[PDB]
Amino acid sequence: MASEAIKGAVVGIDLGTTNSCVAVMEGKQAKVLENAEGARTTPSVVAFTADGERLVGMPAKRQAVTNPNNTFYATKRLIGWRYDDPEVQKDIKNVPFKIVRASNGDAWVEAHGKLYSPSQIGAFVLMKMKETAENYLGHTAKNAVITVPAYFNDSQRQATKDAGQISGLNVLRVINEPTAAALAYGLDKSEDKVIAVYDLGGGTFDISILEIQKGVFEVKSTNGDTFLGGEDFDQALLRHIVKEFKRETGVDLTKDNMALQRVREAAEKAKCELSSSVQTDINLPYLTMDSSGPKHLNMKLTRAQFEGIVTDLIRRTIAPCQKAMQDAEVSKSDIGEVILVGGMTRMPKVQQTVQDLFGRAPSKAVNPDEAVAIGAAIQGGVLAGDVTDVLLLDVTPLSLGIETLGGVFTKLINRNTTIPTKKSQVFSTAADGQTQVEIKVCQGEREMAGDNKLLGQFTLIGIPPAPRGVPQIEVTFDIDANGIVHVSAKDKGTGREQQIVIQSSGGLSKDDIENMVKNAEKYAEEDRRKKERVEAVNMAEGIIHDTETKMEEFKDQLPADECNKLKEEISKMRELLARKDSETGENIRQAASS
Amino acid sequence: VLLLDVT
Amino acid sequence: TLLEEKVKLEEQLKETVEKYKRALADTENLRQRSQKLVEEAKLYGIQAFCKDLLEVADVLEKATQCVPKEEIKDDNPHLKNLYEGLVMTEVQIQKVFTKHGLLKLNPVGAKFDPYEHEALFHTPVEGKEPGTVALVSKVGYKLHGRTLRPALVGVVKEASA
Amino acid sequence: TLLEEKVKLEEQLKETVEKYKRALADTENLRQRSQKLVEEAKLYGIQAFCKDLLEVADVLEKATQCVPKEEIKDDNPHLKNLYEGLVMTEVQIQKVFTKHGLLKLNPVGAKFDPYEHEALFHTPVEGKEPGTVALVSKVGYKLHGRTLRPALVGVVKEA
């Protein structure tokens, strides 16, 4: 068949067991969309009330206690499976909700005397996420790319496709989670390689060995631990904290409910803090109230203690990965890249284990929590419409602009501006009676004239005399095609134009984009301060010039010895120790009235 | 000779 | 080959004309969505800061509640001054909270709404309409209609009889 | 006749490709400008929040510093417990402030800086350099490196 003419917006939905994420192609990069509550990840929970409701997400989690037999969670472990299955038989006992058998002998669910397939719960979740995407987009999201685990068979992939179709989504393709992570990490455009995708942090641990031969991804092997996730690490930390609190004081927080939630949140923040900091503190004033008085929790937690608390859990990820490499028929030297997915992989202990296990320092340049959805968005942008056209659209490496009377760097075109762009700005003459106007073109990121570079320079000669500020000169940059900059100065009202075709439009393509903007951020507040200083100097100089010109116009019966505040202004000018001269700019007195 | 800026 | 090549090139020309039309549509849609996002970021954007300070506000309220208030006396003047400072701090944090749209949710007897309330228990209570909130364990907050923290409530259940 | 079709098609194709590239670059620049506008709105909201947040921390710290340290003893259990809870609360407040870019300004002995400090009074002090913060009357604050509230300092003069 010919081109399908999608001509629309393709969302990438990461349909997870616990939490789902949706992202879209925002030009050259994927953007993870936040839901109606401002959270980027939506729980895959659906619930039905007595009369009729379809609470999806956190609204269903909050109501779960009041409606435990009609709140369906972790249904992605029931999709594509028959009723008479081992794993389904283990799962039916624990789940509070009802799991029934359909006519086709499939494990369905029951809610107030109604039958829903495990694909229909996912369809409701996908409807919620499609609404989330549409709210940001403003139009309908008709196409979608939905990710599935690499161990799904064709039946479960078809169930996911049907779930996407029920939600009103034209599912372009059903992608893997390892493949989506590889696309997010940018291994799609790479030579033939074997990569390992380390997925720790969700409700499951997954390790998949992939091959990128010919430019396409093949799943060589898959493995993991089903009963290991990111909740176990937090549970271990919380247990350690409450045990320490009971040891130090004598009160068990397990009986308390509010205190347990406070300690759980504090443990989550402490675990997130022990990935960049060696030590952390857990402060919880007024944790519990006793007959002897309130008790305040104060714990010092170091990274060594944390990595000793969860050492067994991390060690439980070494046998599955070795077995996955055995199934793929590869060794440590045969792995060309390691990919980190999941929020629990940010600790240096997990990354050290991965490096010691695969022989390669893991790739951690992408947010592991939102990598599958971002890769699905990338794949959707590639599959449909034209996104690669914006991918080949070259952008400016560094910002461009011209000079300014006070040495300021007036920025016409900023740093990350696509090349075929024309921008124009109008500027006035410097002083009264000025006829020669000179343009100084320079490139950089600092707010100063000569502190960045100097591309070229020309002159606009020929200007009718006029009072300062009245002549209008339209300086326009004409960056066209791909590359060279056609700077042109236009004297609005009259002729005598000027032009230049300055070369080296990012010709020195190097890490200057990474380094010149690196030290332009540290030296920013000081640069802003000096720029404000020179702006105030220019304003005060203009005001004093206006006052002097007005004073030299009226002289008779003018006892303006009190109007000598310009002396104080000049004294303030010769002082590099003040914030700005705007506050002392109140020197525009015109009591003479022309 | 230096260009100004419109306020 | 000349005529077929010309026809194919004209087809490509029409395709890229349609691409240009699509680009104009996309930039119009982007203008609309950007004007939406700016207002959204003006309303919210202190969401993370507010969610971080909620626990400080709760701790200040708990501190006010914890002092027995029988020891607030001129006999103990330093505990009195500290208590007045704590009370002033609590009223100040609640005054800056409601200034920026952060409103407290305390549904003492409202109907259970699973969009601002997180049910903690389903204990049946006599004399109360089923489905209402029996008690609020922790007050919830919301800014500009966005439920930051749900009110941890306890919903009542129908009598078993 | 038929050759004119080639010239017309080539000219139209080049003009249309130029227009299409320029229109595809317009949307990207508009997107980047919109991102800048949204970031500016977020920054303004957070700054306006912090400006009125500062008073809460000021009141709490003044309250917990008023109490002398010699009366926090075991024969006043209610004063000791309240003092410990309140100092832990202000530590929590300052940690939350630091996490979100808001940093304190306590330039004890640091050199004077007009962009961060405000000279409440000028008085010579022995053992301290001129133009140096001998005493800080009120603590200042910084938001992302820019002074949200200048510190009220005391500048050593020449005697």
Q: In whole angstroms, how far apart are CA D33 and each of A357, C51, C131, D28, D37?
A: 45, 29, 49, 9, 6
And the tokens for D138?
A: 């009120």
And the tokens for C17?
A: 């004309």
Q: Are residues D11 and D73 in the same domain?
A: yes
Residue ending a domain, choose from D100, D124, D143: D100
Q: In whole angstroms, how far apart are CA D159 and each of D130, D136, D155?
A: 10, 20, 12
Q: In whole angstroms, how far apart are CA A345 and each of A147, A177, A233, A348?
A: 20, 16, 11, 8
* Non-local CB neighbours of A268 within 8 Å, separated by 6+ positions: A234
> CA C2, CA C12: separation in Å to the nearest integer?
15
Report phi then psi at D32, rounded to 5: -65, -40
- Our count of domains for chain D comes to 2
> CA C117, CA C146: separation in Å to the nearest integer?
13
Domain that holds residue D107: 102-159
> CA A72, CA A124: separation in Å to the nearest integer?
11
Residue whose pair of structure tokens reads 């997107």 in the numeric block: D31
Q: How many Å is the Cα radius of gyration of chain D?
A: 30
Q: Are residues D83 and D50 in the same domain?
A: yes
SS3 C94: helix
**A329 belongs to the catalytic site:** no
* Non-local CB neighbours of A339 within 8 Å, separated by 6+ positions: A178, A181, A182, A185, A187, A195, A196, A197, A198, A362, A363, A371
- Residues A430, B4: contact at Cβ < 8 Å? yes
- Give a yes or no: residue C121 inside a domain: yes
- Residues A384, A399: contact at Cβ < 8 Å? no
- Give a yes or no: residue C145 inside a domain: yes
Crossing angle, helix C77-99 and helix C47-66, to 10 degrees? 150
Residue whose pair of structure tokens reads 């472990």 in the numeric block: A77
Check the CA dihedral C19-C23-C24-C29 and report its sign: positive
CA atoms within 13 A on the CB side of D39: 6
Supply angle C-alpha A199, A204, A209, rounded to 5. Answer: 40
Interface of chain D toward chain A, CB-CB under 8 angstroms: 18, 21-22, 24-29, 31-32, 77-78, 81, 84-86, 88-89, 91-92, 95, 114-115, 145-146
Q: Between C114, C115, C146, which is nearest A38 by CB?
A: C146
And the tokens for A100?
A: 């029934």
Q: In whole angstroms, how far apart are CA D29 and each of A416, A475, D22?
A: 8, 19, 11
> CA A323, CA A199: separation in Å to the nearest integer?
15
Provide, as residue numbers in chain B, all residues whose Cβ is less than 8 Å from the Cβ of A475.
Answer: 3
> CA C50, CA D45: separation in Å to the nearest integer?
12
Minimum distance, in Å, between the CA of residue B5 and any CA atom of chain A? 5
Instruction: Name the active-site residue from A106, A130, A177, A370.
Output: A177
- Displacement of CA A563 from its chain's centroid (Å): 57
Residue ending a domain, choose from D58, D76, D100: D100
**A199 belongs to the catalytic site:** yes
> CA A499, CA A512: separation in Å to the nearest integer?
28
H or E element that contains C63 = helix C47-66
Strand partners, A363: A339
> CA A550, CA A537: separation in Å to the nearest integer?
20
> CA A507, CA A402: separation in Å to the nearest integer?
20
Q: In whole angstroms, how far apart are CA A567 and each of A537, A539, A541?
A: 15, 16, 12
Strand partners, D147: D142
Residue by residue, what is the 3-state secondary structure of A15-34? CCCCEEEEEEEECCEEEECC
Side by side, the strands of the sheet bearing C133-138 are: C117-121, C151-155, C133-138
Type of residue found at C98: T
Q: Are residues D109 and D94 in the same domain?
A: no
Strand partners, A439: A458
Cross-chain residue pair C89–D59, CB shorter than 8 Å: yes
β-pair type (C140-143, C102-105) = antiparallel
Q: Are residues D72 and D132 in the same domain?
A: no
Nearest to C112 by CA among C128, C126, C133: C133
Strand partners, A176: A148
**A535 belongs to the catalytic site:** no
Residue ending a domain, choose from D100, D119, D135: D100
**A76 belongs to the catalytic site:** yes
Q: Are residues D6 and D71 in the same domain?
A: yes
> CA D56, CA D53: separation in Å to the nearest integer?
6
Q: A 410-429 residues with CB below 8 A of C? A: none
CA atoms within 13 A on the CB side of A533: 18
Dihedral of CA atoms A11, A16, A19, A20 in degrees, nearest 10, equals: 10
Number of cross-chain residue pairs from C and D with Cβ atoms under 8 Å apart: 152
- Give a yes or no: residue C70 inside a domain: yes
Q: Are residues D132 and D153 in the same domain?
A: yes
| CB environment A293-303: b (16+ within 10 A), e (fewer) | bbbbbebebeb
- Residues A198, A318: contact at Cβ < 8 Å? no
SS3 C35: helix
Q: Are residues D57 and D115 in the same domain?
A: no
Q: In whole angstroms, how far apart are CA D92 and each of A154, A285, D104?
A: 52, 9, 14
Query: Whole-angstrom distance between the N-terminal and C-terminal Cα of chain C?
Result: 90
H or E element that contains A542 = helix A525-551
In this complex, whether B and C touch, counting 3 or more CB pairs under 8 angstroms, is no
Provide, as residue numbers in chain C, all residues whose Cβ is less than 8 Å from the Cβ of A63.
Answer: 112, 114, 119
Crossing angle, helix A154-166 and helix A118-137, to 10 degrees? 50
Minimum distance, in Å, between the CA of residue C7 and any CA atom of chain A? 17
Q: Are residues D96 and D107 in the same domain?
A: no
Minimum distance, in Å, between the CA of residue C118 and any CA atom of chain A? 4
Cross-chain residue pair C114–A285, CB shorter than 8 Å: no
| Burial status of residue A3 (CB atoms within 10 A of its CB: 0-12, 13-18, 19 or more) | exposed
- Residues A57, A43: contact at Cβ < 8 Å? yes
Q: Are residues D8 and D84 in the same domain?
A: yes
> CA A140, CA C41: separation in Å to the nearest integer?
23
| DSSP, res D39 | H
And the tokens for A414?
A: 């900023």
Count the Cβ atoms, other than its own, within 10 Å of residue A42. Answer: 23
> CA C35, CA A457: separation in Å to the nearest integer?
38
Q: Are residues D94 and D108 in the same domain?
A: no
- Residues A453, A444: contact at Cβ < 8 Å? yes
SS3 A351: helix
Cross-chain residue pair C112–A66, CB shorter than 8 Å: yes
CB distance from A62 to chain C under 8 Å?
yes
- Give a yes or no: residue C3 inside a domain: no
- Give a yes or no: residue C83 inside a domain: yes
| Ranges assigned E (strand) in A325-420 | 337-341, 399-402, 410-413
Instruction: Name the active-site residue from A106, A128, A130, A199.
Output: A199
Nearest to A196 by CA among A180, A207, A183, A185: A207
Query: Whole-angstrom distance between the N-terminal and C-terminal Cα of chain A?
Result: 81
SS3 A110: strand
In CATH, what number is assigned to the domain containing residue C68?
2.30.22.10
Name all domains of chain A by residue range, CATH numbers in brackets.
10-178 (3.30.420.40), 187-227+314-366 (3.30.420.40), 230-312 (3.90.640.10), 399-522 (2.60.34.10), 528-594 (no CATH)
- Give a yes or no: residue C139 inside a domain: yes
CA atoms within 13 A on the CB side of A395: 21
> CA D52, CA A24: separation in Å to the nearest integer?
37
SS3 A206: strand
| Chains linked to C by 3 or more Cβ pairs within 8 Å | A, D
Q: Are residues D111 and D73 in the same domain?
A: no
- Give a yes or no: residue C96 inside a domain: yes
Q: Which residue of A has its CA nearest to C30?
A: A137
Type of residue found at A243: K
- Residues A320, A207: contact at Cβ < 8 Å? yes
Left (φ > 0), alpha (ψ -120 to 50) or beta: where does C3 sit?
alpha
Strand partners, A73: A45
Cross-chain residue pair A428–B1, CB shorter than 8 Å: no
- Displacement of CA D49 from its chain's centroid (Å): 11
- Give a yes or no: residue C11 inside a domain: no
β-pair type (C133-138, D140-143) = unpaired
Nearest to A171 by CA among A226, A232, A129, A220: A129
Q: Are residues D108 and D84 in the same domain?
A: no
| Chains linked to B by 3 or more Cβ pairs within 8 Å | A
> CA A411, CA A119: separation in Å to the nearest integer?
54
Number of cross-chain residue pairs from A and C with Cβ atoms under 8 Å apart: 58
And the tokens for C8?
A: 């194919």
Residue whose pair of structure tokens reads 């940690």 in the numeric block: D95
Minimum distance, in Å, between the CA of residue D55 and any CA atom of chain A? 21
> CA D29, CA D21: separation in Å to the nearest integer?
12
Dihedral of CA atoms A168, A171, A176, A179 in degrees, nearest 10, equals: -120
Crossing angle, helix A118-137 and helix C2-43, to 10 degrees? 90
* Non-local CB neighbours of A510 within 8 Å, separated by 6+ positions: none
Check the CA dihedral A546-A549-A554-A558 and report its sign: positive
| Ranges assigned E (strand) in D7-150 | 102-105, 117-122, 133-138, 140-143, 146-149
